[PDB]
RNA sequence: GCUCGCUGGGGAUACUGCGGGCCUUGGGACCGGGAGAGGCCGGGGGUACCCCCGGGGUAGGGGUGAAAUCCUAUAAUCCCGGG
């Protein structure tokens, strides 16, 4: 019939991770991060690295019989920043261009209802 | 005039003081329908985060203006089921 999977995208200011699993999430199909396609630590969160990683993951998934994916994109969340980095949209676009169909798209960033205390003291980073 | 201070008598009753009588406006008591993260005690929850166990996967993760220390083949980061 139709084999559909899930693409988990983890986007921060330092890196990007693209992880394709099956429909239930318990079996991993492919997994690629920004540090596996570039040489400079400064280029890990760039959109171009996201495109490269997404292309590699999409090819590996396509060779195994996956047809389309639903997308779940997240920032670090918690007591860290709630906003996704610059590589999320580039990752989303590259998956479609590689040949996979796209289902529904939603963000699953974990948000606290007044949880724990963040780092930096009561004055924050002083730079 | 000064020693602005003392003392024997007579007169007045507006104000202050003292005694008596009569009030309700200030203050207090009580009744009615409502408002509020005011306080104390008991019970039930919400996501988030950390650690441990089991399944998948394999070479990086993290962090900076740029790096390094640090974590990772005793299988990390990431995903799933539980405590
Ligand atoms: Mg890296
Ligand atoms: Mg410190
Ligand atoms: Mg300075
Ligand atoms: Mg395991």
Tab-separated table of C-alpha atoms (C1' of nucleotides) and ligand atoms in Angstrom:
chain	number	residue	atom	x	y	z
A	1	UNK	CA	0.000	0.000	0.000
A	2	UNK	CA	1.534	3.272	1.210
A	3	UNK	CA	4.457	3.371	3.633
A	4	UNK	CA	4.433	6.671	5.529
A	5	UNK	CA	6.997	7.769	8.091
A	6	UNK	CA	7.809	10.706	10.371
A	7	UNK	CA	10.566	13.311	10.029
A	8	UNK	CA	11.708	14.747	13.365
A	9	UNK	CA	13.649	17.992	12.916
A	10	UNK	CA	15.660	19.418	15.817
A	11	UNK	CA	16.824	22.982	15.175
A	12	UNK	CA	18.919	25.182	17.470
A	13	UNK	CA	21.490	27.954	17.102
A	14	UNK	CA	24.387	25.469	17.089
A	15	UNK	CA	23.260	22.480	15.008
A	16	UNK	CA	20.438	20.738	13.155
A	17	UNK	CA	19.337	17.096	13.289
A	18	UNK	CA	17.043	15.343	10.796
A	19	UNK	CA	15.700	11.947	11.854
A	20	UNK	CA	13.337	9.818	9.752
A	21	UNK	CA	11.465	7.000	11.519
A	22	UNK	CA	8.415	4.873	10.745
A	23	UNK	CA	4.784	5.734	11.493
A	24	UNK	CA	4.950	4.602	15.128
A	25	UNK	CA	8.321	6.237	15.830
A	26	UNK	CA	9.876	3.098	17.321
A	27	UNK	CA	12.060	2.169	14.317
A	28	UNK	CA	14.765	4.436	12.906
A	29	UNK	CA	15.121	4.710	9.133
A	30	UNK	CA	17.811	7.387	8.840
A	31	UNK	CA	19.501	10.098	10.883
A	32	UNK	CA	21.801	12.932	9.796
A	33	UNK	CA	23.146	15.993	11.607
A	34	UNK	CA	24.857	19.163	10.462
A	35	UNK	CA	28.234	18.030	11.759
A	36	UNK	CA	28.300	15.067	9.368
A	37	UNK	CA	28.286	17.115	6.144
A	38	UNK	CA	30.528	20.116	6.892
A	39	UNK	CA	33.995	20.681	8.337
A	40	UNK	CA	33.683	24.026	10.163
A	41	UNK	CA	31.874	24.276	13.490
A	42	UNK	CA	30.672	27.702	12.359
A	43	UNK	CA	28.684	26.206	9.463
A	44	UNK	CA	26.704	23.557	11.364
A	45	UNK	CA	23.466	25.613	11.761
A	46	UNK	CA	23.597	27.151	8.267
A	47	UNK	CA	20.719	26.505	5.838
A	48	UNK	CA	23.065	24.888	3.304
A	49	UNK	CA	24.145	22.199	5.769
A	50	UNK	CA	20.467	21.581	6.489
A	51	UNK	CA	19.831	21.095	2.768
A	52	UNK	CA	22.701	18.617	2.456
A	53	UNK	CA	21.647	16.585	5.496
A	54	UNK	CA	18.014	16.542	4.374
A	55	UNK	CA	19.008	15.298	0.921
A	56	UNK	CA	21.101	12.475	2.376
A	57	UNK	CA	18.332	11.407	4.759
A	58	UNK	CA	15.672	11.561	2.042
A	59	UNK	CA	17.726	9.400	-0.317
A	60	UNK	CA	18.351	6.796	2.384
A	61	UNK	CA	14.646	6.734	3.257
A	62	UNK	CA	13.537	6.490	-0.380
A	63	UNK	CA	15.780	3.506	-1.056
A	64	UNK	CA	13.970	1.603	1.731
A	65	UNK	CA	10.412	2.110	0.451
A	66	UNK	CA	9.139	5.199	2.290
A	67	UNK	CA	6.825	7.351	0.169
A	68	UNK	CA	5.853	10.339	2.320
A	69	UNK	CA	6.376	11.780	5.783
A	70	UNK	CA	4.679	13.895	8.418
A	71	UNK	CA	6.911	16.619	9.844
A	72	UNK	CA	7.530	17.420	13.520
A	73	UNK	CA	9.893	20.368	14.043
A	74	UNK	CA	11.170	21.516	17.431
A	75	UNK	CA	13.453	24.029	19.089
A	76	UNK	CA	15.339	23.059	22.275
A	77	UNK	CA	12.518	24.406	24.428
A	78	UNK	CA	12.372	23.758	28.145
A	79	UNK	CA	14.380	26.423	29.951
A	80	UNK	CA	16.309	27.150	26.738
A	81	UNK	CA	15.147	29.179	23.733
A	82	UNK	CA	11.675	28.563	22.303
A	83	UNK	CA	12.440	29.680	18.737
A	84	UNK	CA	13.689	27.324	16.008
A	85	UNK	CA	16.970	28.093	14.320
A	86	UNK	CA	17.520	29.134	10.719
A	87	UNK	CA	17.821	25.595	9.343
A	88	UNK	CA	14.271	24.353	9.900
A	89	UNK	CA	12.625	25.801	6.785
A	90	UNK	CA	15.536	24.850	4.533
A	91	UNK	CA	15.294	21.302	5.871
A	92	UNK	CA	11.545	21.175	5.207
A	93	UNK	CA	11.929	22.412	1.633
A	94	UNK	CA	14.766	20.013	0.798
A	95	UNK	CA	12.749	16.927	1.765
A	96	UNK	CA	9.998	17.720	-0.742
A	97	UNK	CA	12.482	18.552	-3.498
A	98	UNK	CA	14.178	15.176	-3.041
A	99	UNK	CA	10.955	13.350	-3.972
A	100	UNK	CA	9.103	12.606	-0.718
A	101	UNK	CA	5.471	13.590	-0.322
A	102	UNK	CA	4.614	15.863	2.602
A	103	UNK	CA	1.749	15.230	4.996
A	104	UNK	CA	0.817	17.563	7.832
A	105	UNK	CA	3.301	19.914	9.496
A	106	UNK	CA	3.324	20.924	13.161
A	107	UNK	CA	5.775	22.094	15.813
A	108	UNK	CA	6.215	20.110	19.020
A	109	UNK	CA	8.490	22.382	21.048
A	110	UNK	CA	8.155	21.524	24.766
A	111	UNK	CA	6.717	24.504	26.643
A	112	UNK	CA	6.679	24.638	30.464
A	113	UNK	CA	3.780	25.808	32.582
A	114	UNK	CA	6.216	27.703	34.812
A	115	UNK	CA	8.884	25.014	35.169
A	116	UNK	CA	12.490	25.263	36.347
A	117	UNK	CA	15.110	28.000	36.533
A	118	UNK	CA	17.410	28.911	33.609
A	119	UNK	CA	21.143	29.559	33.663
A	120	UNK	CA	22.995	32.856	33.933
A	121	UNK	CA	22.006	34.190	37.341
A	122	UNK	CA	19.630	37.080	37.820
A	123	UNK	CA	21.613	39.314	35.441
A	124	UNK	CA	22.133	36.930	32.506
A	125	UNK	CA	25.083	36.779	30.151
A	126	UNK	CA	27.046	40.029	30.357
A	127	UNK	CA	28.806	40.502	27.028
B	1	G	C1'	7.540	105.647	83.888
B	2	C	C1'	10.413	101.140	86.003
B	3	U	C1'	10.792	96.451	89.621
B	4	C	C1'	4.551	92.994	84.457
B	5	G	C1'	4.715	90.978	90.251
B	6	C	C1'	1.650	90.141	95.091
B	7	U	C1'	-2.613	90.987	97.887
B	8	G	C1'	-8.253	93.049	100.558
B	9	G	C1'	-13.066	94.172	98.441
B	10	G	C1'	-17.248	95.362	94.595
B	11	G	C1'	-19.448	94.389	89.494
B	12	A	C1'	-20.366	91.441	84.456
B	13	U	C1'	-21.319	86.512	82.148
B	14	A	C1'	-19.719	86.312	75.743
B	15	C	C1'	-15.632	82.532	75.675
B	16	U	C1'	-12.558	78.351	78.526
B	17	G	C1'	-13.168	75.319	83.143
B	18	C	C1'	-16.753	72.774	86.628
B	19	G	C1'	-22.142	70.508	87.873
B	20	G	C1'	-27.020	69.022	85.819
B	21	G	C1'	-30.566	68.194	81.562
B	22	C	C1'	-31.651	67.349	76.247
B	23	C	C1'	-29.881	65.786	71.020
B	24	U	C1'	-27.621	63.194	66.189
B	25	U	C1'	-24.455	65.199	62.111
B	26	G	C1'	-18.408	62.632	63.905
B	27	G	C1'	-17.239	57.568	65.608
B	28	G	C1'	-19.015	52.648	66.810
B	29	A	C1'	-22.919	48.288	66.751
B	30	C	C1'	-26.502	45.452	63.699
B	31	C	C1'	-29.408	43.621	59.264
B	32	G	C1'	-29.567	42.691	53.349
B	33	G	C1'	-27.928	41.295	48.216
B	34	G	C1'	-23.174	41.327	46.083
B	35	A	C1'	-16.988	41.928	44.985
B	36	G	C1'	-11.794	40.446	45.757
B	37	A	C1'	-4.055	36.564	43.858
B	38	G	C1'	-6.527	38.998	52.110
B	39	G	C1'	-4.842	34.613	55.793
B	40	C	C1'	-4.492	29.281	57.725
B	41	C	C1'	-5.522	23.727	57.215
B	42	G	C1'	-6.702	19.125	54.222
B	43	G	C1'	-7.223	16.779	49.258
B	44	G	C1'	-6.737	16.454	43.930
B	45	G	C1'	-3.921	18.016	39.347
B	46	G	C1'	-0.747	20.522	35.044
B	47	U	C1'	3.059	20.746	31.606
B	48	A	C1'	8.368	21.097	31.991
B	49	C	C1'	13.135	19.241	33.771
B	50	C	C1'	16.797	15.350	35.964
B	51	C	C1'	18.118	10.113	36.965
B	52	C	C1'	17.335	4.541	36.114
B	53	C	C1'	15.605	0.055	33.210
B	54	G	C1'	14.128	-2.079	28.135
B	55	G	C1'	13.684	-1.571	22.266
B	56	G	C1'	15.804	1.065	17.474
B	57	G	C1'	20.452	3.336	15.208
B	58	U	C1'	25.759	4.529	14.645
B	59	A	C1'	29.606	8.510	14.896
B	60	G	C1'	29.599	12.300	16.800
B	61	G	C1'	27.173	15.686	20.565
B	62	G	C1'	27.822	20.143	23.362
B	63	G	C1'	29.612	25.365	23.478
B	64	U	C1'	31.854	30.332	21.610
B	65	G	C1'	33.172	36.520	18.624
B	66	A	C1'	36.660	32.171	17.487
B	67	A	C1'	38.023	27.835	20.361
B	68	A	C1'	39.156	24.485	24.248
B	69	U	C1'	37.963	21.877	28.713
B	70	C	C1'	33.676	18.314	29.140
B	71	C	C1'	30.103	13.856	27.372
B	72	U	C1'	30.524	9.514	23.779
B	73	A	C1'	32.231	2.184	20.902
B	74	U	C1'	30.880	0.103	28.896
B	75	A	C1'	26.970	2.797	22.221
B	76	A	C1'	26.440	9.239	23.335
B	77	U	C1'	23.307	13.244	20.878
B	78	C	C1'	18.165	11.892	18.548
B	79	C	C1'	13.239	8.636	18.566
B	80	C	C1'	9.767	5.001	21.275
B	81	G	C1'	7.589	2.014	25.831
B	82	G	C1'	7.942	2.117	31.423
B	83	G	C1'	9.581	3.365	36.753
C	1	LIG	MG1	29.726	18.856	15.264
C	2	LIG	MG1	29.229	29.396	36.194
C	3	LIG	MG1	34.368	42.603	26.373
C	4	LIG	MG1	19.296	1.590	24.111
